[model samples]
Target: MFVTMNRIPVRPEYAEQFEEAFRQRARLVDRMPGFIRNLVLRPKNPGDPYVVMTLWESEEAFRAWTESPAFKEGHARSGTLPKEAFLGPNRLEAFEVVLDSE
Candidate 1:
């Protein structure tokens, strides 16, 4: 499995908007070919940004989905979140899951 995570910083006041955006994008991503699932996680300490996590069947599928129009639309729309709340550059991370046989 492959996963990509985009952590978006948002003011606590904009939490509703942020969640709406993630829900919309997750629906769009769910229509993709290799999409496994999507999740939105918030910080418990109240100083962290919301985490947008996307799971895919493989790296190739993730690449393809990223290049697709649906993905483009999602990416474009995601940027609609207010930028004023950001304290620094958003964090993006990708990883491949390793199953343990041991």
Candidate 2:
């Protein structure tokens, strides 16, 4: 499986908005081709943010969604807070899933 992750830094004040946006994005995975599942992960302690992950059958499937117009509209609508809410850098990483329990 291929996994794509986006870590968004959002302070406490914007937690609700961040979570709601994450939830909305998570829903899109269900309608995508080759989508396995997705989750909006929250940190256990301070100095952390939300992690959005979607599992796909292959890298091509992931790229297809990433390049789609829906991808652009979705992120644009989701990003309402000021950029400074981020801790340092906005991170996006793509990985090959070696193992997964689910």
Candidate 3:
């Protein structure tokens, strides 16, 4: 399996709005090939970032998703946030699952 993570730094006060944006917006990944699932994880510590993670069947599949038109549409609002709504830039990471226990 392949995994991608985007760690978004959001101000504590703007957390709800961040989540609301996802709730109201449409994400096109659901219909994409080889898409597994996605998750937005809240910070566990005060300084930690909110982790947005997605799983794919392979790196190629994940790469295709990033280049698709839906990817562009999904990220259209990414630049519309107020400056104060975020704590910092988002950090993106990708990895291949090397092992699984279950």
Candidate 4:
């Protein structure tokens, strides 16, 4: 399995807006090839970063998505967020799942 996690440090004042953006945004990735699932993790504390996790069948599939127009569109929307909305640099990490219980 291929896993990708994005750590987005959002400002305290824009936290709600960021969450709402995901809720109302078009889910283009749902129809993507090899896409298993996704989750948006919000911190319990008022000022912690949010984590976006996506699981794919393989790295190739994930790469295809990244090269597609949908990827561009999704990022375009994300870029609309005000610069002040971010508290720090966003981090994107990818991993290959080496073990699974199920």
**In order, what is each prediction's RMSD in angstroms?**
2.5, 2.0, 1.8, 1.6
Which lDDT values do the candidates have, in the order given?
Answer: 0.79, 0.75, 0.80, 0.84
Cα lDDT of model 4 by residue, 13-98, tens digit: 88878877775544878899999998999988868888989999999999999898887787666657445688789899999999
Most lDDT-accurate candidate: 4
In candidate 2, which residue ranges exceed 4 Å CA deviation? Answer: 81-84
lDDT of 4 at 45: 86
Q: What's model 2's TM-score?
A: 0.82
- Ranking of models by lDDT: 4, 3, 1, 2
TM-score of each: 0.83, 0.82, 0.86, 0.88
Query: Model 4, which residues run further than 4 Å from truth?
Result: none
lDDT string for model 3 (1-82, tens) is 9999998888877887777776544367889999998998998784678888999999999899889988877776553543
Q: What lDDT, from 0 to 1, does candidate 4 have? A: 0.84
Give the 10-residue window scoring lowest on summed lDDT in candidate 2.
79-88
Give the lDDT of residue 77 in candidate 4: 65
Question: Which 10 consecutive positions of candidate 1 have the poorest summed lDDT?
Answer: 78-87
Clashes of each: 0, 0, 0, 0
lDDT of residue 79 for candidate 3: 39
TM-score between model 3 and native: 0.86
Give me the runs in candidate 1 sitting further than 4 Å from their true place. Answer: 81-83, 100-102
- Per-residue lDDT of model 1, residues 1-102, tens digit only: 898998877778777777776676667777788889888899895678878888898989988987899877877676664456566678999998887363
